[PDB]
Amino acid sequence: KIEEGKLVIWINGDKGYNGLAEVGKKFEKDTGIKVTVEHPDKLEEKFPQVAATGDGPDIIFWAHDRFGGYAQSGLLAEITPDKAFQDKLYPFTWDAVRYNGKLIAYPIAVEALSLIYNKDLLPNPPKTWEEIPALDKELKAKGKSALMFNLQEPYFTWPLIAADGGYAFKYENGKYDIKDVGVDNAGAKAGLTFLVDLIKNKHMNADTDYSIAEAAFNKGETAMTINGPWAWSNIDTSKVNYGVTVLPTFKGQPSKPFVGVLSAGINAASPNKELAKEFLENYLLTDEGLEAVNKDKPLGAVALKSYEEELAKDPRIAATMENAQKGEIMPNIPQMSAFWYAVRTAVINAASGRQTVDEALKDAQTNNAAAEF
Amino acid sequence: MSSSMECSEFVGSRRFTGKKPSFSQTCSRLSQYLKENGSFGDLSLGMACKPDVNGTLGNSRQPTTTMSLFPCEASNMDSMVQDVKPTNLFPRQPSFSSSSSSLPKEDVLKMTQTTRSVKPESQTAPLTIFYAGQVIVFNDFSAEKAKEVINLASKGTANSLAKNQTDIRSNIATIANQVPHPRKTTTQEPIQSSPTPLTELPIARRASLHRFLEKRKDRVTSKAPYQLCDPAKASSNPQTTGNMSWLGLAAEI
Amino acid sequence: EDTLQQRLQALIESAGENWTYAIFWQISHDFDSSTGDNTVILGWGDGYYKGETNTAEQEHRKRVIRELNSLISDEEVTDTEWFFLVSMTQSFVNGVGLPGESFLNSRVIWLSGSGALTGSGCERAGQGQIYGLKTMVCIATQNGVVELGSSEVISQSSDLMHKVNNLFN
Amino acid sequence: MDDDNGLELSLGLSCGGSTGKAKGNNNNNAGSSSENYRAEGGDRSAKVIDDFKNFLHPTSQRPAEPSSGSQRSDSGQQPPQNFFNDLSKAPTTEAEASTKPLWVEDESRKEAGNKRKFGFPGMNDDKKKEKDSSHVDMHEKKTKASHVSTATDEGSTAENEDVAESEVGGGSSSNHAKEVVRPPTDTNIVDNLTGQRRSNHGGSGTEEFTMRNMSYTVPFTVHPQNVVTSMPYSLPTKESGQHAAATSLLQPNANAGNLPIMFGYSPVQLPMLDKDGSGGIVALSQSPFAGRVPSNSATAKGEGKQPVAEEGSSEDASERPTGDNSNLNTAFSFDFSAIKPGMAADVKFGGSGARPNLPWVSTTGSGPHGRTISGVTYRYNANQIKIVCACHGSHMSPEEFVRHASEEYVSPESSMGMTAASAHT
């Protein structure tokens, strides 16, 4: 049972939880109602388990792609914004969080992956993936490396896979065909083969995760990384002269990252739905609340129209939205999480060498096909 | 002697109660249960779950089938110890276990006959079962009983065992192939989570009473529970007109 | 499985009569190395229950139900629910049993009434009759067998086989 | 056309009755003439060694015995018949074997064979009357080459194979080879006057026809590997292994363990294992115990030359070394069906694998472990050992003669020349 008379919010550990806690302290000063912000590990898997039994947080912040699945299990309340509040946010941000005709999960921010490069080590970042190994043959002469990023999460490895082809689910005739999965076509095999070739020739390490790549970039040990605005962020501490630019192209075609909408959903079992509504609509989704969150950890291009003039002052947001222009809005269908797991398997067996590219993508295709059949 | 006076007191005690307190006890027991939480919409599907993992999890759980009703949930044990203070109704020496033949037929008989109990629709036959070894390379009974079986078979020429005079002996062996320990699981015996021990009740008496109650169960297997009230009005309601919801032996029909 | 779930639920939602459940038996192929025959075997594909004992059985059933609840995430378990659940464990060689007979001969087999059920000689129909069912229907399709069960007595409607032929390939 | 003497089958109970055998209006009768059996069923394979008696027991469901039971060995046209129920006996098997029929309800024919050889290496069948009429059961018998299953020796000493074979073998080409990493095994010495450069002046093979035993002395260099000893052409797999090692073990000349490779009991008596040995090993520990069925679980320790017992075998066992004869006695008081596993009999620390794996089962009701035959002559004393279990231990169990009109005991409780051994337990 969730305690009535307070708000519990879960947010990912790389996001602005202290800024959200300051917004909750403003809510506590104005209303007397305490807001507790937590950041548990594996929260996107823990949330449906405790939510099914009537437990969990009042509000969850996460990308929209899982929330439709949360909608199928009855775990989210239908939200009730009026027309004036709906006119304060961008139309495509409302379009991304629609499931079965009903609005859920208040949009917070638009996120896309960018290339972050050290201007001192590399004033001219590469435009193509293909020239990354040869560049990596030079920085090893100086004790450095070209590129390090998290190979354990398929979200970061998707832009190389998606460049020459490959897709999540086929969209045709105004609907998804969930049995038509594009993990084993020519473009996906070419992208994952290029990644495995990058690993075989010792240009990257298959064990590299978020923390190791972040620490390596913050110490000037690698010239590039691939991440979103939440790295800026202590890269902001590191005083490295960094730049934010477009992902490299592959076989003449641009990388196609998934574009994420960080959104705020209300648990259907919460007895504080009106308090959560007041907190999210009237305090968080304002200029000063989003400003307070961005000062902790930048959210990217937030959905609030009136902050856009501030967004134009940050050219890194322009680079983020340039990468978003070359990407796609994620589907919100419930099968996507299993999709992520399959792609999460498909990289790791390929990256470690325990399976080839063809066997790993074949196994992912059989997994998905068995799931629908 | 004073046995007749005790029997008269027992008849006097039983005539007052007759049927209503036992009926009320059983009804009270049923009434308290099922009131905790009703989902009314939960559905068990075969899509998310898998039959193979269900079989492995069923094998892993111990015991698979409850050998006895839980004492903490329902005070069945209280009735047994209600008027039993030691009273060694097997009056030969205890540890009735590893004590082999030299098991006379008259040493259970003396106490049991005197009890003035239910009429002997009781089979009164014990299925003593001896599993000699875990691997199946052994004479398929105890040797002392086996030599008597060999002598009777030699008298009968031991041609076909299929045409047995009594099929109960052949069937009961198939029905129960195990001793009071189900699978000898490492954690089956060290259990301290059933907070009312049975006070080391004898397995044989409990098994005989249990199988006679399973004869009560198979006679209880009826197509419709309420034959008499079915033509008048048949409807589905989460309520019971009779709290017991079953009937026992016929009173005068 | 989810789409087949939806279509099995759809099949009984538009059904004229009160059918208790619906089961799709699914074809498969196992390679028997002794006879060299890629034998077709029917097994549990999907199912949808709609609906309407003694202490030891109900405690066993409630134990199984709370084990399943523990897996996914205490009312009594009726005989139809328990028959539906235990039916997940059965597999059927092509030609063997009521669905294998329906599949091998591509015909509809309609067992209506407890007399027909006990007199058919199929063990599954007998166990169903024990467990409260009065009508059992097997209809062959392209990729398996649709089995309907009901506690009521229902006579042969062509509309049912029409719906089955429409909603399934 | 006709036979003067009636057929010996008419004993069994017959029921003369009215129409329909399914209704029991019939009179039983018993014809008192003579017994019956047949031949169907058998062990499907028997592995035996030299010097060890072999029981062979077909099973037997009752139209035969005017129908003599014939054991034959299956090569050529219409296989040579070894043994009958009729008193005919093959000249190459006189005093070597004995068939015994036994009757209606204990139904079995017992072949007993004394000294198995490579003249019996093959298919056997055991059959009722008319050999050429398909009423048969077949039994692959398996034979020769008990050996020093795990040899040492010390790196500047002299070791010796002792390698049994048979009359085929008595005129032969015996082989000693070292196993290498492929199915071929390259011969190290051969009795056809050929000897490897790597073993010259450091080996000597000598056949011995009479006791049926080759010796092979190694005074210089065996090398630690698996080692193979055999007949001609050791690709047909009639070979045995030796495994030799000197990799940080040091133990004298050829240790042993050519014990009975089966015993058969029931809870009436107490078994006595006898395992042989050699010089250095009399100092080391010796143990029997049963290796556990799970592969992960390691073998446990039972009885030992240092006085560790098992908590259920303490008073119930005895171990007895004998260093001059290099023998070891193991005495297990109360046989019960909790003991019928496979038994290891190891001669170092468990784990080192230097042990013969005995089976010890049977389903029966006689029991008696003893030297079942004995030899003595006029005016000599004799002895034997004749044993008891825990249940019959309270009652006296003195030795008694096998066949007598009335019960009598050969040896009285009083001891004048020798004293009976009664290890109370």
Coordinates of C-alpha atoms in Angstrom, one line a residue, chain A residues 69-258:
Chain A
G69 CA 3.2 -2.0 -21.8
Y70 CA 2.5 -0.4 -18.4
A71 CA -0.8 0.7 -20.0
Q72 CA -1.7 -2.9 -21.0
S73 CA -1.3 -4.3 -17.4
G74 CA -3.4 -1.5 -16.0
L75 CA -0.5 0.1 -14.1
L76 CA -1.0 3.7 -15.2
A77 CA -3.9 6.1 -14.6
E78 CA -5.4 7.9 -17.6
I79 CA -4.3 11.6 -17.3
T80 CA -6.7 14.5 -17.6
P81 CA -4.9 17.7 -18.9
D82 CA -7.2 20.5 -20.0
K83 CA -6.9 22.2 -23.4
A84 CA -4.9 25.1 -22.1
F85 CA -2.2 22.8 -20.6
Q86 CA -2.1 20.7 -23.7
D87 CA -1.5 23.8 -25.8
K88 CA 1.7 24.5 -23.6
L89 CA 3.5 21.4 -24.9
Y90 CA 4.6 20.4 -28.4
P91 CA 2.1 18.3 -30.4
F92 CA 4.6 15.5 -31.3
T93 CA 5.4 15.1 -27.7
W94 CA 1.7 14.3 -27.0
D95 CA 1.7 12.1 -30.1
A96 CA 4.6 10.0 -28.8
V97 CA 2.8 9.2 -25.5
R98 CA -0.6 8.1 -26.9
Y99 CA -1.6 4.5 -26.5
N100 CA -5.0 3.1 -27.7
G101 CA -6.3 6.6 -28.1
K102 CA -5.8 7.7 -24.5
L103 CA -3.3 10.1 -23.2
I104 CA -0.8 8.8 -20.5
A105 CA 2.5 9.9 -19.1
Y106 CA 3.1 13.7 -19.1
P107 CA 6.0 14.6 -21.5
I108 CA 9.1 16.0 -19.9
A109 CA 11.8 16.1 -22.4
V110 CA 13.1 15.0 -25.8
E111 CA 16.4 13.1 -25.8
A112 CA 18.7 12.0 -28.6
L113 CA 22.2 10.6 -28.8
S114 CA 25.1 12.7 -29.9
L115 CA 28.8 12.4 -30.5
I116 CA 30.8 14.1 -27.8
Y117 CA 34.4 14.8 -28.8
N118 CA 37.6 16.3 -27.1
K119 CA 38.5 19.4 -29.1
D120 CA 42.1 19.4 -27.8
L121 CA 42.8 15.8 -28.9
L122 CA 40.5 16.0 -31.9
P123 CA 39.5 19.4 -33.3
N124 CA 38.0 17.8 -36.5
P125 CA 35.7 14.9 -35.5
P126 CA 35.1 12.3 -38.1
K127 CA 32.0 12.3 -40.3
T128 CA 32.1 8.6 -41.1
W129 CA 32.3 5.4 -39.0
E130 CA 34.8 3.9 -41.6
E131 CA 37.6 6.3 -40.7
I132 CA 37.3 5.6 -37.0
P133 CA 39.8 2.5 -37.0
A134 CA 42.5 4.4 -38.9
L135 CA 42.2 7.3 -36.6
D136 CA 42.3 4.8 -33.7
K137 CA 45.7 3.6 -35.2
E138 CA 47.1 7.1 -34.5
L139 CA 45.9 7.8 -31.0
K140 CA 47.3 4.5 -29.7
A141 CA 50.7 5.9 -30.8
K142 CA 50.0 8.7 -28.2
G143 CA 48.5 6.5 -25.5
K144 CA 44.9 7.5 -26.3
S145 CA 42.0 5.9 -28.1
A146 CA 39.4 7.1 -30.6
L147 CA 36.1 6.0 -29.2
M148 CA 34.7 4.3 -26.0
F149 CA 31.0 3.9 -25.2
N150 CA 28.7 1.5 -23.4
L151 CA 28.4 -1.7 -25.3
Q152 CA 26.3 -3.4 -22.7
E153 CA 23.1 -1.3 -23.5
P154 CA 21.7 -1.7 -27.0
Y155 CA 20.3 1.9 -27.0
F156 CA 23.8 3.2 -27.6
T157 CA 24.7 0.6 -30.3
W158 CA 21.5 1.0 -32.3
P159 CA 22.6 4.0 -34.5
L160 CA 25.3 1.9 -36.1
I161 CA 22.9 -1.0 -36.6
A162 CA 20.1 1.3 -37.9
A163 CA 22.2 3.2 -40.4
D164 CA 22.3 0.8 -43.4
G165 CA 18.8 -0.6 -42.6
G166 CA 17.2 -2.6 -39.8
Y167 CA 14.1 -1.5 -37.8
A168 CA 12.2 -2.5 -34.6
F169 CA 8.7 -3.2 -36.0
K170 CA 7.3 -2.7 -39.4
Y171 CA 4.6 0.0 -39.7
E172 CA 2.1 -0.5 -42.5
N173 CA -1.5 0.3 -43.3
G174 CA -1.8 2.5 -40.1
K175 CA -0.7 -0.3 -37.8
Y176 CA 2.3 -2.3 -36.6
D177 CA 3.1 -5.8 -37.8
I178 CA 4.7 -7.3 -34.7
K179 CA 5.7 -10.5 -36.5
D180 CA 7.8 -8.5 -39.0
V181 CA 11.0 -7.8 -37.0
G182 CA 14.1 -6.4 -38.7
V183 CA 16.9 -7.5 -36.5
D184 CA 18.5 -9.9 -39.1
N185 CA 18.3 -8.0 -42.4
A186 CA 21.4 -6.8 -44.4
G187 CA 21.7 -3.4 -42.8
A188 CA 21.6 -4.7 -39.2
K189 CA 24.1 -7.5 -40.0
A190 CA 26.4 -5.0 -41.7
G191 CA 26.2 -2.6 -38.6
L192 CA 26.8 -5.4 -36.0
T193 CA 29.5 -6.9 -38.2
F194 CA 31.3 -3.5 -38.3
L195 CA 31.0 -3.3 -34.5
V196 CA 32.4 -6.8 -34.0
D197 CA 35.2 -5.9 -36.5
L198 CA 35.9 -2.8 -34.3
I199 CA 36.2 -5.1 -31.3
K200 CA 38.2 -7.9 -33.0
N201 CA 40.9 -5.4 -34.1
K202 CA 41.2 -4.1 -30.5
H203 CA 39.9 -0.6 -31.3
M204 CA 37.4 -1.0 -28.4
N205 CA 36.8 -3.4 -25.5
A206 CA 33.6 -5.5 -25.3
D207 CA 33.5 -5.2 -21.5
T208 CA 33.3 -1.3 -21.6
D209 CA 30.2 0.0 -19.9
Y210 CA 28.8 3.4 -19.0
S211 CA 30.9 4.1 -16.0
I212 CA 34.3 3.0 -17.5
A213 CA 33.7 5.0 -20.8
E214 CA 32.5 8.0 -18.8
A215 CA 35.6 7.9 -16.5
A216 CA 37.8 7.4 -19.6
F217 CA 36.4 10.5 -21.3
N218 CA 36.5 12.6 -18.1
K219 CA 40.2 11.9 -17.8
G220 CA 41.1 12.7 -21.4
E221 CA 41.9 9.0 -22.2
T222 CA 39.5 8.7 -25.2
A223 CA 38.9 11.3 -27.8
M224 CA 35.2 10.6 -28.4
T225 CA 32.1 9.1 -26.8
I226 CA 28.5 8.6 -27.8
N227 CA 25.9 9.7 -25.3
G228 CA 23.0 12.2 -24.7
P229 CA 22.8 15.4 -22.7
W230 CA 23.1 13.6 -19.3
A231 CA 26.9 13.2 -19.8
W232 CA 27.5 17.0 -20.2
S233 CA 27.2 16.7 -16.7
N234 CA 30.6 16.2 -15.0
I235 CA 32.1 16.1 -18.3
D236 CA 30.9 19.5 -17.0
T237 CA 33.2 18.9 -14.0
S238 CA 36.1 17.6 -16.0
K239 CA 36.9 20.9 -17.7
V240 CA 37.7 19.0 -20.9
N241 CA 37.2 21.3 -24.0
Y242 CA 34.3 19.2 -25.4
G243 CA 32.0 19.5 -28.4
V244 CA 28.7 18.0 -29.2
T245 CA 28.0 17.1 -32.8
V246 CA 26.3 14.7 -35.3
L247 CA 26.8 10.9 -35.2
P248 CA 29.0 9.5 -38.0
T249 CA 27.5 8.1 -41.1
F250 CA 27.8 4.5 -42.2
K251 CA 28.0 3.3 -45.9
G252 CA 27.0 6.9 -46.9
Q253 CA 23.8 6.9 -44.9
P254 CA 23.3 8.7 -41.6
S255 CA 23.0 6.9 -38.2
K256 CA 19.4 6.5 -37.0
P257 CA 19.3 6.7 -33.2
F258 CA 16.0 6.1 -31.3

